[PDB]
C-alpha atoms as one frame of an Amber mdcrd trajectory, in Angstrom:
protein
   7.938 -16.863   3.522   4.696 -17.907   1.902   3.908 -19.103  -1.792   2.781
 -15.739  -3.064   1.923 -12.326  -1.454   1.271  -9.445  -3.807  -0.400  -6.040
  -4.098  -2.394  -5.984  -7.338  -3.984  -2.782  -8.544  -7.384  -3.039 -10.340
  -5.743  -0.972 -13.213  -1.973  -1.724 -13.121  -0.681   1.113 -15.385  -2.802
   3.897 -14.002  -1.612   7.324 -12.965  -3.861   8.508 -10.078  -4.683  12.131
  -9.586  -5.501  14.255  -6.550  -8.743  13.163  -4.967  -8.993   9.893  -6.833
  -9.584   6.398  -5.549  -6.723   3.838  -5.639  -8.084   0.369  -5.397  -6.833
  -3.195  -5.735  -6.393  -6.496  -4.003  -3.760  -8.064  -1.763  -3.577 -11.640
  -3.084  -2.244 -14.404  -0.927  -1.408 -18.043  -1.827   0.029 -20.768   0.454
   1.631 -24.118  -0.174   0.641 -25.652   3.171  -2.223 -25.056   5.494  -1.538
 -21.789   7.420  -3.322 -19.683   9.832  -3.191 -15.983   9.323  -3.561 -13.327
  12.052  -3.963 -10.286   9.790  -3.327  -8.717   6.502  -2.584  -4.991   6.997
  -1.927  -2.068   4.487   0.151   1.064   4.556  -0.177   3.412   1.650   2.387
   6.215   1.770   3.179   9.194  -0.321   6.087  11.450   0.340   7.451  14.322
  -1.742  10.633  16.340  -1.274  12.013  19.348  -3.118  15.111  21.457  -2.761
  15.628  24.858  -4.503  17.581  28.010  -4.346  16.233  31.502  -4.022  19.297
  33.673  -4.503  21.686  32.710  -1.697  18.780  30.917   0.256  18.694  27.153
   0.147  15.115  26.058   0.548  13.663  22.583   1.068  10.341  20.999   1.773
   9.320  17.587   2.758   5.543  16.616   2.719   3.962  13.347   3.684   0.783
  13.789   1.789  -0.608  10.297   2.018  -0.549   7.987   5.080  -3.314   5.381
   4.903  -3.364   2.359   7.255  -5.942  -0.374   7.436  -6.484  -3.974   8.325
  -8.106  -5.764   5.334 -10.689  -8.463   5.548 -11.732 -11.379   3.369 -15.496
 -11.198   2.627 -15.972 -14.875   3.577 -14.005 -16.136   6.488 -15.120 -14.574
   9.787 -13.889 -12.543  12.783 -14.010 -12.298  16.548 -11.341 -12.176  19.226
  -8.360 -13.908  17.696 -10.361 -15.691  15.055  -7.873 -16.486  12.310  -8.394
 -17.220   8.668  -7.182 -20.682   7.526  -5.485 -20.617   4.150  -4.991 -23.863
   2.227  -3.083 -24.717  -0.925  -4.963 -24.407  -4.273  -6.768 -21.155  -3.421
  -6.217 -17.496  -4.036  -7.312 -15.335  -1.076  -8.062 -11.793  -2.224  -8.246
  -8.943   0.237  -9.715  -5.872  -1.375  -8.399  -2.463  -0.565  -9.331   1.129
  -1.529  -8.430   4.597  -0.386  -8.580   8.129  -1.892  -5.706  10.299  -2.498
  -5.952  13.779  -0.886  -7.165  16.781  -2.926  -4.403  19.387  -3.505  -0.753
  18.860  -4.214   0.853  15.443  -4.262   4.328  16.657  -5.039   4.316  16.398
  -8.844   4.521  20.171  -9.477   7.482  20.685  -7.244  10.023  23.035  -8.988
  13.570  23.439  -8.298  16.899  21.779  -8.609  15.788  18.557  -6.818  12.314
  16.952  -6.717  11.048  13.553  -5.774   7.584  11.915  -5.301   7.413   8.349
  -3.770   4.038   6.665  -3.525   3.458   3.044  -2.693   1.362   0.415  -1.052
   2.927  -2.077   1.454   0.953  -5.110   2.662   1.848  -6.972   5.789   1.027
 -10.605   6.424   1.017 -11.439  10.195   1.101 -15.190  11.181   1.492 -16.985
  14.510   5.104 -17.697  15.432   6.499 -16.046  12.269   7.825 -12.540  11.728
   5.543 -10.258   9.592   6.098 -10.667   5.933   6.002  -7.500   3.671   5.416
  -6.782   0.098   5.608  -3.398  -1.494   4.307  -2.036  -4.840   4.701   1.561
  -6.170   2.104   3.501  -7.801   2.093   6.694  -9.911   0.348   9.940  -9.171
  -0.258  13.388 -10.833  -1.413  16.706  -9.209  -4.956  17.714 -10.206  -5.364
  21.184  -8.994
């Protein structure tokens, strides 16, 4: 496991609405010289609700956001299995950005049970190591 691997949003205490851009960096630091195969991103948003209508139990589960990407450093290059070399004393910043869908995100769900769970996970792939993951939640609001 490397020195530091973090999702960092450009505005850390933001609540993002429907249709809005969520942007930040995945920041990587190492303590020894290390080759990196890829940094990948999964942003996920799932909402669930359960409610009663008279005797009828109702439930809904929506995966409203699924964004997957491979991020790039602006500087170090690519090509068939070209890998970035990371060295101690540097912060490697991988920019990301995606838009939330228009429409509901789950925050208006009404009933006896409601949840919305939105986050970004980043994945660091390295030769001869298992993938390392980091995960950071973010907050959303329906704008409809």
